[PDB]
């Protein structure tokens, strides 16, 4: 049970611990996407402001990050069960605050 939580938490950190950024209503050829590769480099240094022509209901929006603590709140629940079933001092599963 705990190995499945650690697997899913780690895959979540590689795929979703950051938000995913979207723009709608902008033409790929308006933004200047290189049609042979589907991409466009831009200078990403601090505080620069991007400006777009788009007005076709054009807007930015983003998918959220996943909260990694949603899995950690299940890891410490399984650590209290591992302590309860084994009968070790709660120190050995790092589970007590005392």
């Amino acid at each position: 049970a705990a190995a499945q939580i650690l697997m899913n938490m780690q895959g979540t950190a590689n795929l979703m611990a950051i938000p995913q950024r979207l723009i709608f209503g902008a033409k790929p050829e308006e933004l200047g996407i290189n049609a042979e590769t589907g991409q466009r480099m831009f200078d990403a240094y601090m505080a620069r402001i991007l400006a777009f022509e788009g007005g076709e209901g054009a807007h930015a929006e983003q998918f959220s990050a996943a909260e990694l603590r949603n899995f950690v709140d299940a890891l410490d629940a399984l650590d209290r069960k591992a302590a309860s079933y084994s009968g070790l001092p709660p120190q050995y599963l790092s589970s007590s605050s005392d």
Partner: protein, 124 residues
């Protein structure tokens, strides 16, 4: 000569053009010809090697010109007291163009999803 010819535009129009109006069709075909060629550089090699591909080019040039020359005078109605017509509310129709549904028939497409890639020069 162009790949399609004024007989193709005539055949899709189902009207016999004026001598003043075959000249228009010839110059509109001369645009549609190189407007495709500038997007597909091998077009004349394909259109002489493959007769099924040739038939797509024949149609798409004649359709692209026919969209433009259909009611090129811009009338909505005419009459003299014994006869009258009125046409549908047709488009202002202001340019020669090839549709995305025609580019995909010629085998080229533009993805509607593309990506902006942030980059910064690494230190050295």
């Amino acid at each position: 000569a162009t790949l399609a010819t004024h007989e193709d535009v005539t055949a899709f129009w189902a009207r016999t053009p004026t001598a003043e109006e075959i000249v228009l069709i010839n110059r509109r075909l001369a645009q549609a010809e190189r407007m495709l060629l500038r997007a597909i550089p091998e077009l004349l090699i394909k259109a002489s090697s493959d007769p099924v591909f040739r038939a797509e080019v024949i149609d798409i040039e004649a359709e692209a010109v026919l969209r433009l020359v259909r009611n090129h005078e811009g009338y909505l109605s005419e009459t003299d007291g014994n006869y009258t017509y009125m046409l549908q509310a047709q488009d202002p129709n202001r340019k020669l163009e090839i549709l995305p549904e025609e580019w995909e028939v010629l085998g080229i497409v533009r993805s509607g999803l593309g990506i902006l890639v942030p980059t910064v020069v690494l230190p050295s």
